[PDB]
């Protein structure tokens, strides 16, 4: 069970970026996906998560109206859609999976490799 | 007090045996014009098959107990035989042959045809292989076909094909196939990486001896499975991680004659050769073969000893056991395959037209002469070995070759209805 | 807010293909003693079949897309072939014939029978038709059967009948047949007078060329249908409102000889004629034919022109295409049918015993000799025409004749389960 | 006011006809290696079958209307014929025989074999029974096989057995078998001691004429059943309460020769006799037979008169009707059986190899020669009698022998759904 993300991007401020993450080795719709970012010099910033089955999401208050998540189960792929990019958005964008035992966050042991976005 | 409550849709099963059905790719439906196995009487495969990996399911597998092998055994034989029902008996053609050498693997034989065209008789000639016919001891000029005193041989209807199309086998509703996805799993025992499969991948009905080909390469190392690696009564199945290329040919542009031996009845026979006589042969990359073989030893020595001498020349059995064989372009080649094992590469091959579906009882099929030259190539993907620590190639039958693929799967039956105690009593 | 509600028993359907089954009248069950199609292996028809006229149902029909024709194609051929499985091979009888004329449509041939009664040989003679046998070019006295160098012909078991019994075809539960009751409806397009049928009327498995007979007259006018009436690649089907009477005969009281050609094996052959030789022929009322034909032109000219010259003499194809044919009393007549079209009535007919089920591949059936005279009559109910505005009779195969009846019906599948929004929410 | 209420699971039934299926004992599954009836294609019997005696159920039975007999008729014949499909035609062996006596029930015949080994001919000799072959009238030295001018006879495949294994017949779900347990019940009419059976006991497919054997003894008295005991067109079935022992033998240690009459084709024939010629015969305890026969008369006289003379010598029909017969050790004995009835015991028996499944149309099976001596014994349990008050043994066919056992049972269909008036109205 691995997570495979797309490539890196370079954007100017005011731009938007979309980062994919493919569900290799496991059922796409059987485990909710998280998105976490790490800007240079920073710790780990949570952006939100998406339910690959239902399309349900939760996002950080910091990004209301700015960070969106979508999915397309026909290709087993989840996506992170980030707009209003600024210089603070330079960083590594990672996809990750939790155990969701009881449908509640436990901790995430499966991570994608992360992609970088420069702004 | 707990109460009995019925729960339906319980995700449990028990191991079970049922019949799997075929599923075709797309083209096979319309290959009925020639192809025996790639029939029209077969539903399509799922264009988008699903697979579910299970989290905590560990089950025991045993490839030598895999009953799917028996189904394939019977199905191939039955379908093959069904296709030959309307074909031509060669019984009256066994009467006589006056032979000399081709101008001695191939004989130029003349013959006397018994009353043919109602009140007429005729004489003809044809080319024959020494592997299909034998001399009369007190003549040494006259010949007969080898199988004549036991049974009937028919010439396959010209409109025939045995192309080994990768037909899929699917489970019926109420059943499922569990697959072992553990790349390091041996032939028996528990497997933890297990997934649910409704239908398997396609498996080509390849017929060969002393060679596993055109599929199923190992996970970056040579993988060897055996029932024991101990008992000399058992055999060893070897999977290669890389294939070895083999190029085979019969560079003789042959023609064929249609001989009528009565109104309404005829058969084809080998006619003249256009051009010279070339020997059938196969080109195996030597370096790839032996580099791989060195790697095979690296894996094999784990069970048999680090300085142990392994892999000697083919030996034991009659020529169809000792020689390597395949249908190149549909033509039947018997290759010495001793060069490959001349140390513990181009091989000569012989041609034979009377064949069995692995092994028949009494009866046999005759492969009609093929017009033009033979060219084919293939992917060597594995070996079957014979214990003597010398190993030699060969052994087994169709079920060993089928098993070498089927080992990945087992069939179970879904048992959704059950009960459990609850705190809830029925209300009335 | 509307809610999802499930409704079951919804009166809708989709077009679908399924297998129709036969249904017998009353007598056919016990006709197994001879009759191939009127089998015992068939359930009875509904003694009181129902039909429902629908008020607002309009559907598209297309007789050239009516798949029921394929089912009839295959069923007649299969059943016919099954009945011939135990019958006698005439292969050894093709060996020789020394012929003179009957004392030359009919030849008096002597022949030499090869070892027959174990260690004996014998000579016999029989009468043969010129349409079944051919001479040897360099003899002009010796003959062979025409089909001998391609395949096996068997003599139908004497206990056989092909009486064209009007067997009904019925739909299985879950399916229904919709009928177009519009008397003016052409071969394709919408039909508003539609009714539901569970089972069709009986259709006789009539075999003929150049004639639609013994059923389905038009609604007081000549009715002509065609895929196009334009394209020369298409054909025209003509229905008459009145039938034309035809009286056919072969006034030769013939006998037959049973010839044994070995212990346990024998066949029948035409023996001597009791009385003189009379020509087979058919009497067609001329006035009725031509009065009708004038009326056919009246309808035909609507598509092809008011002063257009139509309906010339038969032409094109071999004698079984060019001549008109039928099994009168089970005997096979080939009539010139040129008198009927000698202007843009008694016809001579020829007799042939080797026949096909419309057209066989290689093989054929031999019609055993019939003792006594042949007499029959029939109802001419329609024509099939060939484009050249000259039209000529003939063309097509069994499916064109089956289609000419099946055009009235199509098969649909009932789809009773569906949903719709309601104002009612589920209560819990 | 009473209301309609539906009751499901109502213990009622109507008489009905369905197909019964076989059930095997334990061993029959693996008897496929030889045995025709004791097939592998048969489910096992219930190791613990149940039976329910009903308190107030009285029903009419009629053994001559028991349709189970037709099922057994057809099944035995069909299975027997299926087993013979791959067997050897003896057609070419009927060509000639030059016979003298064995050194005349058995003839020593030489013969000329037609081209056999492709271009060779050969001469052989074999022993034949006078019951299988007949002389040529104008030679008196030459012989032919009796059935040759009507049909094909094949030699049963050597790997064959007709051991009469007691296979059970069971009803499908929804059906039940009612049994009459009234020991004094005649062939028709009401029976009050009735029980429900899902599956019957096993019945051996015994083939015999003029003898009911190896089962079903009467309840301490001779029990006689007949459709009428009046009409001379009807027959009488006699059950004995005690069996009579019979010991049969053919004390000739025979061998057999395998004769090849072409490459790939051969048959077995009686070879030389090891030792002298002994007559086939059977030893019947005289006292037991006649003491029983006196008792049979005691029962028989109830319908036919106290001083009436009954039971005379066999008479009427051809030798297979007149002589008693059975397959002793698989060998076919035809015994005079006149000593048993020489007053109103060791019998000579004749041997014949061409046999019928009771009676065939045209075709027949040839019993391959049996190596060694024949020894068997059996239990005489009953008789079938012919009206003339003289009675004679014999008459009927397989259905009379099947009926003689099947008379105990009838098949019914369960009809669980019905309605009745109640005082309870539906609530809504
Ligand atoms: C392991 O895998 C290899 C391939 O990966 C298999 O070998 C090939 O098998 C295929 C199928 O049997 C062979 O296909 C044959 O090719 C011949 C030549 O093709 C050329 O010419 C045709 C002419 O129209 C072109 O269409 C085509 O694109 C090529 O240009 C054909 O002539 C053969 O047709 C046969 O059947 C028809 C049916 O009526 C006959 O009319 C023909 O006369 C003829 O009989 C056929 O298509 C292919 O050549 C094989 N070799 C190679 C090198 O690819 C191995 O068999 C496989 N082994 C196992 C055990 O699975
Ligand atoms: C279009 O429709 C016409 C009729 O409307 C069909 O022609 C008739 O078809 C029937 C059926 O095939 C023919 O019936 C035959 O009649 C012969 C003579 O019948 C008289 O003598 C018998 C003697 O007992 C009387 O019972 C009877 O009432 C008459 O008095 C019979 O001899 C024929 O029997 C055949 O089969 C038996 C079966 O064992 C044999 O034993 C006989 O030897 C013989 O083979 C049969 O019954 C009828 O004669 C036809 N002609 C006429 C003028 O009616 C057309 O065929 C039909 N065409 C198409 C394409 O559908
Ligand atoms: C009424 O009931 C009686 C018995 O109650 C039946 O008669 C017996 O029927 C059985 C079955 O047909 C006969 O069994 C035969 O016995 C032969 C000799 O057995 C001895 O030798 C063997 C050697 O291994 C020992 O195993 C055995 O215990 C004995 O010591 C066997 O040779 C026969 O085998 C046949 O089939 C095999 C299969 O390949 C062949 O290889 C053999 O060569 C041979 O063909 C067989 O087992 C038994 O002999 C019968 N007689 C007696 C006196 O019991 C009646 O037939 C039955 N009648 C009816 C109508 O139901
Ligand atoms: C149980 O079995 C499962 C099925 O095999 C296991 O899942 C497999 O896990 C391995 C782990 O390494 C994956 O291997 C990786 O695959 C990626 C795929 O990307 C490449 O291929 C795609 C194909 O279209 C292509 O599009 C990309 O551009 C790449 O070319 C590779 O990049 C990695 O190097 C590596 O090969 C398997 O792919 C994965 N299988 C599936 C079906 O996804 C599972 O782990 C097993 N579980 C246990 C406990 O063993
Ligand atoms: C025997 O070995 C040869 C060599 O490895 C195999 O040939 C290879 O077959 C694969 C099949 O997928 C070819 O892949 C191709 O990739 C392109 C990428 O876009 C795709 O478009 C094609 O449709 C196809 O998938 C691969 O190129 C091909 N290699 C060569 C050199 O041609 C061969 O299939 C093996 N035979 C068997 C029976 O395993
Ligand atoms: C060929 O044309 C002739 C002449 O029209 C057809 O004969 C006719 O067949 C009908 C069948 O119903 C006969 O009807 C009869 O009506 C009486 C009235 O009570 C009834 O009792 C009979 O049972 C029967 O229904 C009609 O009389 C008869 N015409 C003659 C002159 O006999 C013939 O059926 C046509 N053949 C085919 C195959 O269509
Ligand atoms: C023909 O008559 C003879 C003589 O009556 C029958 O032989 C008898 O068969 C019964 C079968 O149950 C034997 O019963 C045995 O009882 C012992 C008691 O412990 C049991 O252990 C055995 O397994 C078996 O049940 C009986 O002893 C036997 N009589 C003799 C003298 O051997 C024979 O079966 C009759 N044949 C037919 C086809 O009815
Ligand atoms: C046809 O007959 C010949 C002999 O007449 C059989 O030849 C034997 O073949 C076996 C095979 O290993 C040899 O061991 C024997 O020595 C051969 N016999 C002789 C006399 O040399 C031949 O096998 C028979 N054909 C079939 C199909 O069985
Ligand atoms: C795998 O090899 C083992 C090795 O011991 C087999 O054990 C056999 O055990 C019996 C018991 O008495 C011995 O007589 C045999 O000689 C042993 N076999 C050998 C080869 O020594 C075990 O049966 C083998 N398993 C398989 C699948 O063959
Ligand atoms: C049997 O052979 C003869 C010739 O040996 C075939 O006769 C040919 O028939 C076709 C039919 O249109 C003619 O065009 C040819 O000219 C005929 N040949 C000759 C030499 O005249 C005959 O058709 C063959 N039989 C079958 C059933 O095919
Ligand atoms: C019925 O006749 C029409 C007449 O136009 C057919 O139309 C064909 O259209 C193609 C289009 O390029 C032309 O090439 C053909 O020549 C036209 N056919 C003729 C006869 O002119 C139409 O296809 C015909 N339909 C049927 C059922 O035959
Ligand atoms: C084979 O032919 C012979 C005569 O050639 C048939 O013999 C007749 O058999 C019946 C049987 O009852 C006798 O009544 C006749 O008298 C016999 N004929 C002569 C001339 O004696 C023999 O039945 C025929 N075979 C078959 C199987 O039918
Ligand atoms: C049983 O015997 C009786 C005796 O009367 C049979 O009755 C028959 O009745 C018809 C009526 O006219 C007579 O013509 C017959 O002659 C009577 N038969 C005898 C033998 O006399 C009754 O049909 C017989 N039942 C069975 C089953 O045969
Ligand atoms: C085989 O050919 C040689 C050539 O001379 C001939 O002598 C011999 O008789 C031939 N044999 C047969 C069986 O025709
Ligand atoms: C497979 O490996 C397991 C590991 O414990 C072993 O127990 C089992 O016997 C092996 N089976 C074979 C056939 O090698
Ligand atoms: C077989 O022929 C192909 C043709 O290009 C070649 O590439 C391949 O290496 C050859 N294989 C061998 C074993 O020579
Ligand atoms: C049938 O008549 C309709 C009338 O509009 C026409 O459209 C259709 O093409 C006709 N079909 C045929 C086959 O004549
Ligand atoms: C056929 O014969 C019948 C016999 O009555 C006759 O009425 C009818 O008109 C005849 N038909 C012809 C075409 O002559
Ligand atoms: C039968 O044998 C006798 C013995 O002398 C012989 O004369 C006679 O010709 C033989 N018959 C046949 C048909 O061989
Ligand atoms: C059976 O006995 C009953 C007794 O009344 C009798 O009515 C019936 O006809 C008898 N049936 C036979 C076939 O003996
Ligand atoms: C048959 O042989 C057995 C052998 O013991 C014997 O007991 C029995 O009495 C014999 N039966 C007859 C009828 O002789």
- How many angstroms separate the Cα of C144 from the Cα of each of A7, C128, C151, C369, D151? 83, 11, 13, 18, 28
Q: Which of C115, C116, C118, C120 to mutate to test the interface with D (most CBs of D within 10 A)?
A: C118
Dist. CA B122–CA B111, nearest whole Å: 9
Q: Which of C89, C116, C119, C264 to mutate to test the interface with D (most CBs of D within 10 A)?
A: C264
The domain locations on chain A are 1-119
- How many angstroms separate the Cα of C217 from the Cα of each of C213, C220, C237, D5? 9, 8, 12, 54
Q: What are phi and psi of B391, to 5 degrees?
A: -115, 145
**Nearest alpha carbon to residue B336 among B276, B280, B391:** B280
What DSSP letter does each residue of B179-214 carry, written as one string?
EE--TT--SEEEESSEEEESEEEEE-----BS-EES
Residue of C nearest to B120 (CA): C95
- Asked whether B231 and B307 are in contact (CB, 8 A), the reply is no
- How many angstroms separate the Cα of C354 from the Cα of each of C160, C320, C358, C360? 16, 12, 12, 11
Q: Name the minimum distance, in Å, from the CA of B157 to any CA of chain C.
A: 15
Kindly compute the dihedral angle of the four CA atoms of residues D401, D402, D404, D406, in this order, to the nearest 10 degrees. 180
Does D119 sit within 8 Å of B150, measured CB to CB? Answer: no
Q: Tell me if there are at least 3 CB pairs under 8 Å linking chains C and A.
A: no
DSSP 3-state assignment of B221?
A: coil
Does B118 sit within 8 Å of C149, measured CB to CB? Answer: no
Residue of D nearest to B148 (CA): D263
Does C260 sit within 8 Å of D149, measured CB to CB? Answer: yes
Dist. CA D167–CA D29, nearest whole Å: 11
Dist. CA D219–CA C45, nearest whole Å: 51
Dist. CA A62–CA D377, nearest whole Å: 102
- Asked whether D353 and D126 are in contact (CB, 8 A), the reply is no
Dist. CA B247–CA C264, nearest whole Å: 58
- Asked whether D252 and D277 are in contact (CB, 8 A), the reply is yes
Dist. CA D387–CA C92, nearest whole Å: 51
Establish if C141 touches chain B: CB-CB under 8 angstroms.
no
Dist. CA D269–CA D260, nearest whole Å: 11
DSSP 3-state assignment of B139?
A: coil
Query: For residues A53-63, b (16+ Cβ closer than 10 Å) or e, as one string?
Result: eeeebebeeeb
| Dihedral sign computed on CA atoms, order B397, B398, B404, B408 | negative
Cβ atoms within 10 Å of D17's Cβ, excluding its own: 13
Residue of C nearest to D112 (CA): C119
Query: For residues D207-234, b (16+ Cβ closer than 10 Å) or e, as one string?
Result: bbbbbbbebbebeeebbbbbbebeeeee
Cβ atoms within 10 Å of C136's Cβ, excluding its own: 12
- How many angstroms separate the Cα of D136 from the Cα of each of C117, D97, D128? 13, 10, 15
Q: Which residues of B, range 247-306, sit inside 8 Å of C by Cβ? A: 260, 263-264
Cβ atoms within 10 Å of A72's Cβ, excluding its own: 12
Query: For residues C158-197, b (16+ Cβ closer than 10 Å) or e, as one string?
Result: eebbbebbbbbbbbeeebbbbbbebeebbbbeebeebebb
Q: Name the minimum distance, in Å, from the CA of D118 to any CA of chain B.
A: 5
Dist. CA B152–CA B234, nearest whole Å: 35
**Nearest alpha carbon to residue C408 among C139, C258, C216:** C216
- Asked whether B215 and B205 are in contact (CB, 8 A), the reply is no
Establish if D119 touches chain B: CB-CB under 8 angstroms.
yes
Does B149 sit within 8 Å of D118, measured CB to CB? Answer: no
- Asked whether B363 and B152 are in contact (CB, 8 A), the reply is yes
Bridge partners, D101 (sequence order): D107
Establish if B148 touches chain D: CB-CB under 8 angstroms.
yes
Q: Which atom of ligand 15 is nearest to the CA of B226?
A: 13
* Structural biology method used: cryo-EM
Task: Compute the half-sphere exposure of residue C243: CA atoms within 13 Å on the CB side of its CA.
Answer: 15
Q: How many CB pairs under 8 A join A and B?
A: 5
- Asked whether B178 and B197 are in contact (CB, 8 A), the reply is yes
DSSP A8: -
Q: List residues near ligand 14 (CB under 6 A).
A: B 98, 141-142
Ligand 4 neighbourhood includes A75 CB (under 6 angstroms): no
Dist. CA D80–CA B195, nearest whole Å: 49
**Three-class secondary structure assignment of chain C:** CCEEEEEECCCCEEECCCCCEEEECCCHHHCCCCECCCCCCCCECCCCCCEEECCCCCEEEEHHHCCHHHHHHHHHHHHHHHHCCCCEECHHHHCCEEEEECCCCEEEEEEEECCCCCCCCEEEEEEEECCCEEECCCCCCEEEECCCCCCCEEECCCCCECCCCCEEEECCCCEEEEEECCCCCCCEEEECCEEEECEEEEECCCCCECCEECCCCCCCCCEEEECCCCCCCCCEEEEEEEEEEEEEEEEEEEEEEEEEEECCEEEEEEEEEECCCCCEEEEECHHHHHHHHHHHHHHHHHHHCCCCCCCCCCCCCCHHHHCEEEEECCEEEEECCCHHHCCCCEEEEEECCEECCCCCCCCEEECCCCCEEEEEEEEEEEEEEEECCCEEECCCCHHHHHHHHHCCEEEEEECCEEEEEECCCCCC
Does C91 sit within 8 Å of B118, measured CB to CB? Answer: no
Q: How far apart are the two ends of chain B, measured CA to CA in Å?
A: 18
Kindly compute the dihedral angle of the four CA atoms of residues B209, B213, B216, B218, in this order, to the nearest 10 degrees. 90
Residue of D nearest to C119 (CA): D95
Neighbours of chain D (3+ CB pairs under 8 A): B, C
Point out the residue among B118, B119, B264 whose CB comes nearest to the CB of C150: B264
- Asked whether A46 and A33 are in contact (CB, 8 A), the reply is no
Dist. CA A88–CA A118, nearest whole Å: 9
Kindly compute the dihedral angle of the four CA atoms of residues C114, C116, C120, C123, in this order, to the nearest 10 degrees. -60
**Nearest alpha carbon to residue C237 among C408, C384, C69, C397:** C384
User: A1-119: which CATH topology?
Assistant: Immunoglobulin-like (2.60.40)
Q: CB-based contacts of B270: which residues, under 8 Å, 6+ apart? A: B126, B127, B128, B254, B256, B257, B369
**Three-class secondary structure assignment of chain D:** CCEEEEEECCCCEEECCCCCEEEECCCHHHCCCCECCCCCCCCECCCCCCEEECCCCCEEEEHHHCCHHHHHHHHHHHHHHHHCCCCEECHHHHCCEEEEECCCCEEEEEEEECCCCCCCCEEEEEEEECCCEEECCCCCCEEEECCCCCCCEEECCCCCECCCCCEEEECCCCEEEEEECCCCCCCEEEECCEEEECEEEEECCCCCECCEECCCCCCCCCEEEECCCCCCCCCEEEEEEEEEEEEEEEEEEEEEEEEEEECCEEEEEEEEEECCCCCEEEEECHHHHHHHHHHHHHHHHHHHCCCCCCCCCCCCCCHHHHCEEEEECCEEEEECCCHHHCCCCEEEEEECCEECCCCCCCCEEECCCCCEEEEEEEEEEEEEEEECCCEEECCCCHHHHHHHHHCCEEEEEECCEEEEEECCCCCC
The helix (run of H) or strand (run of E) holding residue B369 is none
Dist. CA B264–CA C155, nearest whole Å: 17
**Chain C residues within 8 A of D152 when measuring between CB atoms:** 264
Distance D267 CA to ligand 15 centre (A): 53
Top mutation candidate among C149, C317, C361 for ligand 10, by most atoms within 8 Å of CB: C149
Top mutation candidate among C165, C376, C402 for ligand 2, by most atoms within 8 Å of CB: C376
Residue of D nearest to B95 (CA): D118
CA B400 to chain centre: 9
Q: Name the minimum distance, in Å, from the CA of C260 to any CA of chain D.
A: 9
DSSP A98: E
- Asked whether C341 and C130 are in contact (CB, 8 A), the reply is no
Indicate the length of chain A as a whole number.
Answer: 119
Distance B93 CA to ligand 10 centre (A): 26
Top mutation candidate among D189, D230, D233 for ligand 13, by most atoms within 8 Å of CB: D230
Top mutation candidate among D164, D166, D214, D243 for ligand 7, by most atoms within 8 Å of CB: D243
Bridge partners, C332 (sequence order): C327
Does C149 sit within 8 Å of B119, measured CB to CB? Answer: no
How do C280-284 and B212-213 pair as beta strands? unpaired
Q: Name the minimum distance, in Å, from the CA of B199 to any CA of chain C.
A: 27
What DSSP letter does each residue of B61-115 carry, written as one string?
EEGGG-THHHHHHHHHHHHHHHHTTTSEE-GGGGS-EEEEE----EEEEEEEE-S
DSSP 3-state assignment of B153?
A: strand
Does B91 sit within 8 Å of D264, measured CB to CB? Answer: yes
Dist. CA C177–CA C171, nearest whole Å: 7
Q: Which atom of ligand 7 is nearest to the CA of D381?
A: 39
Cβ atoms within 10 Å of C389's Cβ, excluding its own: 13
DSSP B161: B
């Amino acid at each position: 069970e691995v997570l495979v993300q797309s490539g890196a991007e370079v954007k100017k401020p005011g731009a938007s970026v979309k980062v994919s993450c493919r569900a290799f080795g496991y059922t796409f719709t059987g485990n909710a996906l998280h998105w976490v970012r790490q800007a240079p010099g920073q710790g780990l910033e949570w952006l939100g998560w998406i339910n690959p089955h239902s399309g349900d999401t939760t996002t950080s208050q910091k990004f209301q109206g700015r960070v969106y998540m979508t999915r397309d189960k026909s290709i087993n792929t989840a996506f992170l859609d980030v707009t209003r990019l600024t210089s603070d958005d330079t960083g590594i964008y990672y996809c990750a999976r939790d155990k969701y035992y009881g449908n509640e966050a436990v901790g995430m042991d499966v991570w994608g490799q992360g992609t970088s976005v420069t702004v | 007090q707990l109460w009995v409550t019925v729960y339906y849709g319980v995700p449990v099963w028990k191991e079970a045996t049922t019949t799997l059905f075929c599923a075709s790719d797309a083209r096979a439906y319309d290959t009925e014009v020639r192809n025996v196995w790639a029939t029209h009487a077969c539903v399509p495969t799922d264009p988008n098959p699903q697979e579910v990996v299970l989290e905590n399911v560990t089950e025991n597998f045993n490839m030598w107990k895999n009953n799917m092998v028996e189904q394939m055994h019977e199905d191939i034989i039955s379908l093959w035989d069904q296709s030959l029902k309307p074909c031509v008996k060669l019984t009256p053609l066994c009467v006589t042959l006056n032979c000399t050498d081709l101008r001695g693997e191939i004989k130029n034989c003349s013959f006397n045809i018994t009353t043919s065209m109602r009140d007429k008789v005729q004489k003809e000639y044809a080319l024959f292989y020494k592997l299909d016919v034998v001399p009369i001891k007190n003549d040494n000029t006259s010949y007969r076909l080898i199988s004549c005193n036991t049974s009937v041989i028919t010439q396959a209807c010209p409109k025939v094909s045995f192309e080994p199309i990768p037909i899929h086998y699917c489970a019926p509703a109420g059943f499922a196939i569990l697959k072992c996805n553990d790349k390091k799993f041996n032939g028996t025992g528990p497997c933890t990486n297990v997934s649910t499969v409704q239908c398997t991948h396609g498996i080509r009905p390849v017929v060969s001896t002393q060679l596993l080909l055109n599929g199923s390469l190992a996970e970056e190392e040579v993988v060897i499975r055996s029932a024991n690696f101990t008992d000399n009564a058992k055999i060893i199945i070897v999977q290669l991680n890389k294939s070895v290329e083999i190029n085979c040919t019969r560079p003789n542009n042959n023609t064929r004659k249609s001989i009528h031996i009565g109104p309404g009845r005829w058969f084809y026979t080998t006619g003249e050769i256009i051009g010279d006589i070339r020997q059938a042969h196969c080109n195996i990359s030597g370096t790839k073969w032996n580099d791989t073989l060195k790697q095979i030893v690296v894996k094999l020595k784990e069970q048999f000893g680090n300085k142990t001498i392994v892999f000697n020349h083919s030996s034991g059995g009659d020529p169809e056991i000792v020689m390597h064989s395949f249908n190149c372009g549909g033509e039947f080649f018997y290759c010495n395959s001793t060069q490959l094992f001349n140390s513990t590469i181009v091989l000569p091959c012989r041609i034979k037209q009377i064949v069995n579906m692995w092994q028949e009882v009494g009866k046999a099929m005759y492969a009609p002469p093929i017009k033009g030259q033979i060219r084919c190539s293939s992917n060597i993907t594995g070996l079957i070995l014979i214990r003597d620590e010398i190993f030699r190639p060969g052994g087994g039958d169709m079920r060993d070759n089928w098993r070498s693929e089927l080992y990945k799967y087992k069939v179970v039956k879904i048992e959704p209805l059950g009960i459990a105690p609850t705190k809830c009593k029925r209300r009335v």
